Amino acid sequence: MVRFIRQEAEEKANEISVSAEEEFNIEKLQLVEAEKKKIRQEYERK
Amino acid sequence: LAAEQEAQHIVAAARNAKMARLRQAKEEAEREIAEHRAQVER
């Protein structure tokens, strides 16, 4: 009952953590796409 | 009680899990950019 609600709140915190991890993974993919774009930029420049 | 005790641990570990997962995700993500740069360099 009450322990179930507390575990639900803890699982909500863990789900926020997982959503943050997924958003960070997507952001990392975008950042490394930008890094590949930059690498191509100075590579074509070189 | 059980309710007070249980919620604290997972909430505390959530931030560490998010940080570790973000760092790992960036770790393999940078590998793709490094591989593309290596192919371009070759």
Binding site: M1, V2, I5, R6, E10 | A3
Partner: peptide, 17 residues
């Protein structure tokens, strides 16, 4: 303070709170 032990027992029996 006197009923803290009874409250702890009641929380244990009945049961982010």
């Amino acid at each position: 303070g006197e009923f803290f032990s009874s409250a702890l027992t009641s929380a244990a029996a009945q049961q982010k709170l």
